[PDB]
Design an enzyme around this catalytic site. Structure first.
Site, PDB file in Angstrom:
ATOM      1  N   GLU A 228      -2.538  36.922   9.576  1.00 25.08           N
ATOM      2  CA  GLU A 228      -1.241  36.584  10.136  1.00 25.08           C
ATOM      3  C   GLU A 228      -1.370  36.428  11.653  1.00 25.08           C
ATOM      4  O   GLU A 228      -0.839  37.238  12.397  1.00 25.08           O
ATOM      5  CB  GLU A 228      -0.196  37.667   9.812  1.00 25.08           C
ATOM      6  CG  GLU A 228       1.249  37.162   9.957  1.00 25.08           C
ATOM      7  CD  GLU A 228       2.329  38.223   9.743  1.00 25.08           C
ATOM      8  OE1 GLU A 228       1.892  39.361   9.261  1.00 25.08           O
ATOM      9  OE2 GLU A 228       3.514  38.004   9.931  1.00 25.08           O
TER      10      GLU A 228
ATOM     11  N   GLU B 143       6.354  50.715  10.079  1.00 25.09           N
ATOM     12  CA  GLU B 143       5.018  50.935  10.601  1.00 25.09           C
ATOM     13  C   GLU B 143       4.677  52.412  10.905  1.00 25.09           C
ATOM     14  O   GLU B 143       3.587  52.873  10.654  1.00 25.09           O
ATOM     15  CB  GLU B 143       4.711  50.063  11.864  1.00 25.09           C
ATOM     16  CG  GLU B 143       3.425  50.546  12.610  1.00 25.09           C
ATOM     17  CD  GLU B 143       2.905  49.565  13.647  1.00 25.09           C
ATOM     18  OE1 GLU B 143       3.538  48.447  13.673  1.00 25.09           O
ATOM     19  OE2 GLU B 143       1.956  49.786  14.347  1.00 25.09           O
TER      20      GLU B 143
ATOM     21  N   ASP C  89      -3.398  43.388  16.596  1.00 26.31           N
ATOM     22  CA  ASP C  89      -3.661  44.023  15.326  1.00 26.31           C
ATOM     23  C   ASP C  89      -2.882  43.241  14.272  1.00 26.31           C
ATOM     24  O   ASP C  89      -1.656  43.381  14.161  1.00 26.31           O
ATOM     25  CB  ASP C  89      -3.229  45.519  15.348  1.00 26.31           C
ATOM     26  CG  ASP C  89      -1.770  45.733  15.720  1.00 26.31           C
ATOM     27  OD1 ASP C  89      -1.333  44.947  16.690  1.00 26.31           O
ATOM     28  OD2 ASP C  89      -1.057  46.549  15.172  1.00 26.31           O
TER      29      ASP C  89
END
Length: 311
Positions: A115, A203, A57
């Site tokens: 990324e 997160e 992810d």
């Protein structure tokens, strides 16, 4: 309302290592007149057949270049889904980018970045639907207030002291008829101390940040539960796709937050400040960061210049 579709990136790759680039750029032609533009939607398609892509992810985003300043402006952010691509969504991920219509016209430079830390990388196709009609306001201009969003770890340090400016002065053109802020924020990290439920920052830890205008708390941004388990991109197993993150889900776009400014600020200079909910990283489990971009949009039925942002 006639709709035209414009194709841009076609199967471009973002990857890492041994002659590769995490970003891709291109020049594309968009229609020149945007006075008639009602809406502009960007669609991002990611094909990942047979586990051929970086399975994680990852933070990803799209920018448009402001020809006038040479700066890249983030127009959309998303997190790749685990394991698969966007196949379950016929058009791919959808992000409204109407706010940037002034820059999406003529020969336009775009950039897409992921990324990704693997050579398999991710591959995308991006298209835009332009809807013509009769807009509320014919003219618009947009400029960044802050952009700390190059990557998930290039955002603002959360819970540690830093030297990044989070306050700015903004000046709107006297002929502004409507103005608002557009913010995109997402957190990274599993830093301690954990909130209940073993939720580390940034997160997992649910937070509510604030935008202060002229020093008064004015808008709240709740980074809460979006309901990741209801993701139409639901073929992500064995990835940990179902638990809610704070304000985002893997395989979804990061939400766009729009805060409408008070007209009384028009033709004035006001202060903007992004304030994060207080927290201290004890430093026993890594760092935490918030990637954020915040732009001011000014609209008018008469031609309008860009607002002025200063320190």
């Amino acid at each position: 309302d006639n709709t035209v579709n414009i194709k841009t990136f076609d199967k471009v790759k973002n990857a890492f290592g041994d002659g590769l680039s995490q970003s891709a750029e291109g020049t594309f032609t968009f229609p020149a007149d945007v006075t008639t533009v009602k809406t502009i939607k960007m669609f991002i398609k990611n094909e990942c057949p047979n586990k051929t892509c970086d399975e994680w992810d990852r933070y990803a985003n799209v920018y448009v270049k402001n020809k006038t300043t040479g700066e890249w402006y983030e127009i959309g952010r998303f997190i790749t889904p685990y394991w698969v691509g966007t196949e379950k969504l016929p058009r791919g991920l959808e992000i409204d980018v109407t706010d940037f219509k002034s820059l999406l016209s003529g020969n336009t430079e775009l950039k897409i970045y992921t990324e990704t830390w693997l050579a398999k990388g991710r591959e995308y196709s991006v298209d835009f639907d332009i809807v013509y009609g009769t807009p509320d306001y014919k003219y618009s201009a947009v400029v960044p207030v802050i952009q700390y969003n190059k990557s998930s770890i290039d955002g603002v340090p959360y819970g540690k002291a830093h030297t990044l400016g989070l306050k700015k002065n903004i000046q709107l053109p006297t002929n502004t008829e409507k103005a608002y802020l557009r913010t995109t924020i997402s957190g990274w990290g599993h830093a301690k101390p954990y909130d209940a439920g073993s939720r580390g920052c940034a997160e997992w830890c649910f937070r509510t940040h604030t935008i202060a205008i002229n020093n008064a708390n004015t808008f709240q941004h709740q980074l809460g539960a979006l309901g990741c388990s209801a993701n139409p991109i639901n073929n992500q197993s064995p990835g940990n796709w179902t638990p809610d993150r704070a304000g985002w889900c893997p395989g979804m776009a990061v939400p766009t937050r729009i805060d409408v400014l008070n007209n009384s600020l028009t033709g004035s200079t006001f202060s903007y400040e992004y304030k994060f909910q207080s927290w201290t990283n004890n430093g026993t489990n890594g760092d935490a960061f918030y990637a954020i971009s915040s732009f001011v949009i000014a609209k008018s039925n008469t031609p309008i210049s860009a607002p002025v942002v200063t320190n």
